């Protein structure tokens, strides 16, 4: 189960703060230029880091009878 309400307000690249952006499902924080690829502007929605994109599992289709 665990819990992850309050996200981390500290970077994990240069250990610097200020204009930090924490991933949706990942409390981890990063800087615009630090991110790869770096973001030009702050997105207004659900942003996903590399970890999230790499956390994609093969979508299988159950019930394959007949």
Question: Does the protein bind Zn ion through residue 20 (CB under 5 A)?
Answer: no
Contacts of 49 by beta carbon, 8 Å cutoff, 6+ apart: 23, 26, 28, 30, 35
The interface region with Zn ion, picked from 2-10, 17-25, 37-45, 56-64 by CB under 5 A, is 17-25
Question: Does the protein bind Zn ion through residue 26 (CB under 5 A)?
Answer: yes
Query: Of residues 7, 21, 27, 34, which one binds Zn ion by CB under 5 A?
Result: 34
Burial code of 37-60, b = ≥16 C-beta within 10 A, e = fewer?
eeeeeeeeeebebeeeeeeeeeee
Footprint of Zn ion (CB under 5 A): 11, 13-14, 23, 26, 31, 34, 49, 51-52
């Amino acid at each position: 189960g665990a819990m992850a309400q309050k996200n981390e307000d500290e970077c994990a690249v240069c250990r610097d703060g200020g204009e930090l952006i924490c991933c949706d499902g990942c409390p981890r924080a990063f800087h615009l230029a630090c991110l790869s690829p770096p973001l030009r502007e702050i997105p207004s929605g659900t942003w996903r880091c590399s970890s999230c994109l790499q956390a994609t599992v093969q979508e299988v289709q159950p019930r394959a009878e007949e």
